[PDB]
Structure formats: structure tokens, C-alpha cells
């Protein structure tokens, strides 16, 4: 059984996103599992943004072309290099770029590690299939009070579990990986801790996130209505529900 929670605080819509420093073109750290699970929090914290419901990542580097600077979708890049419908680009793909494209926070989306935390509120009892359509460069998803973070303790330092529900790595220089899926059985009305950790090491960043509900509904990119944050309250006695199927409910 995946451990779930019943936080009694004021619920806030969306996930908290923390940003951590990652070295441009570090082709090692991003593929290490200890780093993805907890090691990232050792790195300098750049900032955070709260209340985000649209959590898919799609960052496209600029092409500085003769008619202006425009983002280039990765599948339209060619040669050394240009972008279809724009011609040759005069800027390097291998430098840092600054922009707000990740959740409105000004940082270097070319090279950053994001930590997304919240609680997933299932509306139906049954098995949920989470999915990353692909990943550039690496990402994990963990779900559960024992594996994502502890109940009522969303904002604490990371727990030390490498038991990921999904983990994905783009091999360095390789093509984008295919779909990656992971299934969790969840009970309706319990808040399940959820953590996504995402790294971009250079240039393009991509992480299309979706979930398929037990009825076969698919929710893609925007998780409004499903993900919530609560401020930590370590004093709330009955926050943790080790097994929601045998939980003595008291009303
Ligand atoms: O895989 C390493 C590197 O390969 C290409 O340069 C792009 O797909 C980048 O997004 C990626 O970081
Ligand atoms: Ca990349």
C-alpha cells in the first residue's frame, strides 16, 4: 500500500517548485539516482514559485536569425544550425540562456534542476498510470508518504528514497526517449504526496507529464483540481495514513 495523508491545514491549489543550480553541460550529475532523489538539495537554491498547476516543461532555446530572435522547437533545428522557417541561427546552442519560461521564474532554463512537490487528490479509487511522454534531460516522479515526502511535511528537506514511480534519462547526445509509465493504486479522497525532480543540462528542456485515471480519462499538462499544497504542520497528529484501505475512518 502507498502511504497517503490527511492534512488538516488550509489547502492551496497547485504545486510548489523549487529551483536548484545545475552546471551547464554537466553530463554526469543529471543521470545519477541519488542526485535526482535528494542530492539536488545540496546545490544552491535559486528560488521558488508556488501554486503551479500546469507542470509540463517545454523549453526551446532561441534562434537568433536575420529577422529576429525566436524560440526554435527542437524538431525544427537542423544543420549547424538553423531552424526551419527562420534560416541559419547565429547563436550557440551550448551557452546558458536566461528567461522566465519555467513558471515565470527568471533563471537559466538551459541548466537547472527543479523540484516540484504537492499532494495528488484522486477522485476515483483504482489504478492511475502516470506518464512522461519523453524526457530531456532527466526526471523522476515519486508518489507516497514513504517515497515522495512525509505527510504534513511538504517543505522539509528531501527524503532519501530512490524508489521512483517513474524515472527517465535521455542518454547524452542520444535521441529523446520513448514514453515512460508507472502505475499506482490510489484511494479516493486521500492526499498522496507527489514529487517530480527534473534536470536540464544544456539547451532544450522537455517533460510532458500526464496521468490516466482508473476510468480511462487522461489529464495532460495541467493538473488543476488534482494537485494541492499545504504548509507544513509537524504537530498534526493524525496526518499520516499508512494504509488507506484499512484506515479507521472517524467522522
Ligand atoms: O542529450 C544531451 C543533449 O542533446 C542535444 O544537444 C539536445 O537534445 C539537448 O537538449 C540535450 O541536453
Ligand atoms: Ca537538454
Short mmCIF file of C-alpha atoms and ligand atoms in Angstrom, two decimals:
data_model
loop_
_atom_site.label_atom_id
_atom_site.label_comp_id
_atom_site.label_asym_id
_atom_site.label_seq_id
_atom_site.Cartn_x
_atom_site.Cartn_y
_atom_site.Cartn_z
CA UNK A 1 0.00 0.00 0.00
CA UNK A 2 1.15 3.53 -0.86
CA UNK A 3 1.05 5.72 2.19
CA UNK A 4 -1.26 8.74 1.94
CA UNK A 5 -2.13 11.71 4.12
CA UNK A 6 -5.00 13.75 5.53
CA UNK A 7 -3.53 17.21 6.11
CA UNK A 8 -5.93 19.37 8.09
CA UNK A 9 -4.49 22.76 7.08
CA UNK A 10 -5.60 25.38 4.51
CA UNK A 11 -5.27 23.78 1.11
CA UNK A 12 -3.71 25.74 -1.72
CA UNK A 13 -4.18 24.98 -5.34
CA UNK A 14 -1.09 23.70 -7.21
CA UNK A 15 2.47 22.58 -6.62
CA UNK A 16 5.46 24.27 -5.12
CA UNK A 17 8.50 24.45 -7.46
CA UNK A 18 11.98 24.96 -6.05
CA UNK A 19 14.91 25.73 -8.38
CA UNK A 20 18.46 24.48 -7.79
CA UNK A 21 21.73 25.20 -9.51
CA UNK A 22 22.94 22.76 -12.16
CA UNK A 23 26.20 23.19 -14.23
CA UNK A 24 25.92 23.89 -17.85
CA UNK A 25 26.99 20.82 -19.81
CA UNK A 26 27.49 18.61 -16.77
CA UNK A 27 26.78 15.35 -18.49
CA UNK A 28 27.16 13.23 -15.24
CA UNK A 29 25.17 14.52 -12.32
CA UNK A 30 21.77 14.52 -14.07
CA UNK A 31 21.88 10.70 -14.58
CA UNK A 32 22.78 9.79 -11.05
CA UNK A 33 19.81 8.47 -8.96
CA UNK A 34 20.96 9.73 -5.58
CA UNK A 35 21.29 13.17 -7.14
CA UNK A 36 17.73 13.03 -8.56
CA UNK A 37 16.16 11.69 -5.33
CA UNK A 38 17.81 14.02 -2.75
CA UNK A 39 21.31 15.17 -3.80
CA UNK A 40 19.93 18.17 -5.71
CA UNK A 41 19.06 19.90 -2.43
CA UNK A 42 22.73 20.13 -1.60
CA UNK A 43 23.15 22.53 -4.55
CA UNK A 44 22.45 26.22 -4.12
CA UNK A 45 18.77 27.02 -4.04
CA UNK A 46 17.97 29.65 -6.62
CA UNK A 47 14.39 30.36 -5.74
CA UNK A 48 10.84 29.09 -5.64
CA UNK A 49 7.41 29.70 -7.04
CA UNK A 50 4.14 28.32 -5.63
CA UNK A 51 0.66 27.49 -6.83
CA UNK A 52 1.55 25.92 -10.20
CA UNK A 53 -0.92 23.57 -11.83
CA UNK A 54 0.48 23.46 -15.34
CA UNK A 55 3.60 21.39 -14.71
CA UNK A 56 4.69 20.08 -18.14
CA UNK A 57 8.10 21.51 -19.23
CA UNK A 58 8.71 22.66 -22.79
CA UNK A 59 11.72 24.98 -23.11
CA UNK A 60 13.09 25.89 -26.55
CA UNK A 61 16.29 27.81 -26.99
CA UNK A 62 16.37 30.90 -29.16
CA UNK A 63 17.39 31.08 -32.72
CA UNK A 64 18.98 34.49 -33.42
CA UNK A 65 18.05 34.75 -37.07
CA UNK A 66 18.20 37.53 -39.57
CA UNK A 67 14.56 38.52 -38.87
CA UNK A 68 14.76 38.43 -35.05
CA UNK A 69 15.20 36.11 -32.12
CA UNK A 70 12.55 33.37 -31.75
CA UNK A 71 12.33 30.12 -29.92
CA UNK A 72 13.20 27.16 -32.01
CA UNK A 73 11.32 23.89 -31.45
CA UNK A 74 13.84 21.10 -31.25
CA UNK A 75 12.37 19.08 -34.06
CA UNK A 76 12.79 22.11 -36.36
CA UNK A 77 16.50 22.58 -35.69
CA UNK A 78 18.86 21.34 -38.47
CA UNK A 79 22.47 21.57 -39.67
CA UNK A 80 24.93 23.68 -37.63
CA UNK A 81 22.49 25.20 -37.19
CA UNK A 82 19.28 26.69 -38.40
CA UNK A 83 15.63 26.47 -37.54
CA UNK A 84 13.01 25.68 -40.14
CA UNK A 85 11.23 28.79 -41.40
CA UNK A 86 13.92 31.04 -39.96
CA UNK A 87 17.20 30.12 -41.69
CA UNK A 88 20.63 29.99 -40.03
CA UNK A 89 20.96 30.88 -36.41
CA UNK A 90 23.97 32.90 -35.27
CA UNK A 91 23.94 31.93 -31.58
CA UNK A 92 25.50 28.95 -29.82
CA UNK A 93 23.42 26.06 -28.58
CA UNK A 94 25.92 25.35 -25.84
CA UNK A 95 25.71 28.53 -23.81
CA UNK A 96 23.38 29.49 -20.92
CA UNK A 97 20.25 31.41 -21.70
CA UNK A 98 18.15 33.40 -19.24
CA UNK A 99 14.34 33.52 -19.40
CA UNK A 100 11.12 33.20 -17.42
CA UNK A 101 9.79 30.21 -19.45
CA UNK A 102 9.87 27.94 -16.41
CA UNK A 103 6.88 29.07 -14.28
CA UNK A 104 7.63 32.75 -14.61
CA UNK A 105 10.83 32.50 -12.55
CA UNK A 106 13.88 34.26 -14.20
CA UNK A 107 16.70 31.72 -14.28
CA UNK A 108 18.71 29.72 -16.77
CA UNK A 109 16.33 27.08 -18.13
CA UNK A 110 19.21 25.60 -20.15
CA UNK A 111 20.82 24.32 -16.93
CA UNK A 112 18.72 23.89 -13.77
CA UNK A 113 17.21 21.25 -11.51
CA UNK A 114 13.55 21.77 -10.48
CA UNK A 115 11.81 20.14 -7.52
CA UNK A 116 8.06 20.01 -7.75
CA UNK A 117 6.09 18.93 -4.67
CA UNK A 118 2.43 18.68 -3.86
CA UNK A 119 -0.31 16.27 -2.97
CA UNK A 120 -2.36 14.44 -5.58
CA UNK A 121 -6.03 14.09 -4.70
CA UNK A 122 -7.54 11.13 -6.55
CA UNK A 123 -11.22 11.48 -7.38
CA UNK A 124 -11.59 7.69 -8.01
CA UNK A 125 -10.32 4.58 -6.34
CA UNK A 126 -8.22 2.44 -8.58
CA UNK A 127 -5.02 2.39 -10.52
CA UNK A 128 -3.57 5.55 -12.00
CA UNK A 129 -0.93 5.47 -14.75
CA UNK A 130 1.44 8.39 -14.68
CA UNK A 131 3.44 9.14 -17.73
CA UNK A 132 6.38 11.16 -19.17
CA UNK A 133 5.95 11.29 -22.91
CA UNK A 134 9.69 11.75 -23.18
CA UNK A 135 12.40 13.47 -21.16
CA UNK A 136 15.22 15.97 -21.84
CA UNK A 137 17.44 15.57 -19.82
CA UNK A 138 16.27 13.58 -16.76
CA UNK A 139 13.34 13.33 -14.38
CA UNK A 140 11.88 11.18 -11.65
CA UNK A 141 8.36 11.00 -10.21
CA UNK A 142 7.69 9.56 -6.74
CA UNK A 143 4.34 9.17 -5.16
CA UNK A 144 3.62 8.21 -1.49
CA UNK A 145 4.31 9.26 2.10
CA UNK A 146 7.27 6.96 2.31
CA UNK A 147 8.87 7.83 -1.05
CA UNK A 148 7.95 11.38 -2.21
CA UNK A 149 7.96 13.29 1.09
CA UNK A 150 6.36 12.81 4.55
CA UNK A 151 2.75 13.70 5.33
CA UNK A 152 2.34 17.29 6.59
CA UNK A 153 5.98 17.96 5.84
CA UNK A 154 5.96 19.01 2.14
CA UNK A 155 8.59 21.78 2.65
CA UNK A 156 11.12 19.74 4.64
CA UNK A 157 14.42 18.66 3.25
CA UNK A 158 14.17 15.73 0.79
CA UNK A 159 13.75 12.16 1.97
CA UNK A 160 16.32 9.71 1.00
CA UNK A 161 14.34 7.14 -1.07
CA UNK A 162 15.30 6.10 -4.61
CA UNK A 163 12.19 4.02 -5.11
CA UNK A 164 10.81 6.09 -8.04
CA UNK A 165 7.39 5.55 -9.58
CA UNK A 166 8.91 6.62 -12.95
CA UNK A 167 12.49 7.62 -13.84
CA UNK A 168 13.75 8.68 -17.18
CA UNK A 169 17.15 9.68 -18.66
CA UNK A 170 17.97 10.96 -22.19
CA UNK A 171 21.38 9.35 -22.96
CA UNK A 172 23.91 12.10 -23.62
CA UNK A 173 23.68 13.09 -27.24
CA UNK A 174 21.09 10.41 -27.85
CA UNK A 175 17.62 10.80 -29.24
CA UNK A 176 14.69 11.54 -27.00
CA UNK A 177 13.44 8.52 -25.08
CA UNK A 178 10.02 6.92 -25.72
CA UNK A 179 7.09 7.02 -23.22
CA UNK A 180 7.70 6.05 -19.69
CA UNK A 181 4.80 4.98 -17.46
CA UNK A 182 4.29 3.93 -13.85
CA UNK A 183 1.10 2.74 -12.11
CA UNK A 184 -0.01 3.50 -8.50
CA UNK A 185 -3.21 2.17 -6.84
CA UNK A 186 -4.88 5.09 -5.00
CA UNK A 187 -7.96 5.52 -2.85
CA UNK A 188 -10.32 8.41 -3.47
CA UNK A 189 -10.20 11.36 -1.13
CA UNK A 190 -6.72 10.77 0.36
CA UNK A 191 -3.90 13.23 -0.37
CA UNK A 192 -0.90 11.46 -1.83
CA UNK A 193 2.45 13.11 -1.70
CA UNK A 194 3.98 13.65 -5.14
CA UNK A 195 7.44 14.76 -6.12
CA UNK A 196 8.85 15.43 -9.57
CA UNK A 197 12.53 16.29 -9.89
CA UNK A 198 13.61 17.47 -13.37
CA UNK A 199 17.03 18.42 -14.74
CA UNK A 200 18.12 20.21 -17.87
CA UNK A 201 21.86 20.09 -18.51
CA UNK A 202 22.05 22.02 -21.79
CA UNK A 203 19.81 23.69 -24.42
CA UNK A 204 16.30 22.15 -24.84
CA UNK A 205 14.18 21.01 -21.88
CA UNK A 206 11.16 18.75 -22.26
CA UNK A 207 8.94 16.89 -19.80
CA UNK A 208 5.35 16.29 -20.96
CA UNK A 209 3.51 14.93 -17.94
CA UNK A 210 0.19 13.16 -17.89
CA UNK A 211 -1.93 10.75 -15.86
CA UNK A 212 -4.60 8.27 -16.87
CA UNK A 213 -7.37 7.85 -14.30
CA UNK A 214 -8.94 4.49 -13.45
CA UNK A 215 -11.90 5.34 -15.72
CA UNK A 216 -9.50 5.92 -18.65
CA UNK A 217 -9.63 9.73 -18.55
CA UNK A 218 -6.30 11.29 -19.42
CA UNK A 219 -5.19 14.54 -17.81
CA UNK A 220 -2.25 16.16 -19.58
CA UNK A 221 -0.04 19.07 -18.56
CA UNK A 222 -2.50 20.99 -16.38
CA UNK A 223 -3.36 19.31 -13.10
CA UNK A 224 -5.77 21.92 -11.76
CA UNK A 225 -8.20 20.20 -9.46
CA UNK A 226 -5.82 17.28 -8.74
CA UNK A 227 -2.76 18.80 -7.05
CA UNK A 228 -2.61 20.84 -3.83
CA UNK A 229 -0.05 22.23 -1.38
CA UNK A 230 -0.31 22.60 2.36
CA UNK A 231 2.07 24.43 4.69
CA UNK A 232 3.97 22.05 6.96
CA UNK A 233 2.38 21.26 10.26
CA UNK A 234 4.54 18.78 12.02
CA UNK A 235 2.26 18.90 15.08
CA UNK A 236 -0.77 17.43 13.39
CA UNK A 237 -1.09 14.09 14.96
CA UNK A 238 -3.22 12.14 12.54
CA UNK A 239 -1.73 13.38 9.23
CA UNK A 240 -0.35 10.04 8.02
CA UNK A 241 -2.46 7.17 6.67
CA UNK A 242 -0.20 4.14 6.23
CA UNK A 243 -2.91 2.06 4.55
CA UNK A 244 -5.94 3.82 3.23
CA UNK A 245 -7.72 0.53 2.55
CA UNK A 246 -7.70 -0.29 6.30
CA UNK A 247 -7.88 3.17 7.65
CA UNK A 248 -10.26 3.54 10.56
CA UNK A 249 -12.23 6.46 9.43
CA UNK A 250 -13.63 8.63 12.18
CA UNK A 251 -16.16 11.39 11.26
O1 LIG B 1 21.37 14.71 -24.64
C1 LIG B 1 22.22 15.85 -24.50
C2 LIG B 1 21.68 17.00 -25.35
O2 LIG B 1 21.40 16.52 -26.66
C3 LIG B 1 21.03 17.57 -27.55
O3 LIG B 1 22.06 18.57 -27.55
C4 LIG B 1 19.72 18.19 -27.08
O4 LIG B 1 18.67 17.22 -27.19
C5 LIG B 1 19.82 18.67 -25.63
O5 LIG B 1 18.52 19.03 -25.16
C6 LIG B 1 20.40 17.57 -24.74
O6 LIG B 1 20.70 18.12 -23.45
CA1 LIG B 2 18.62 19.43 -22.56
#
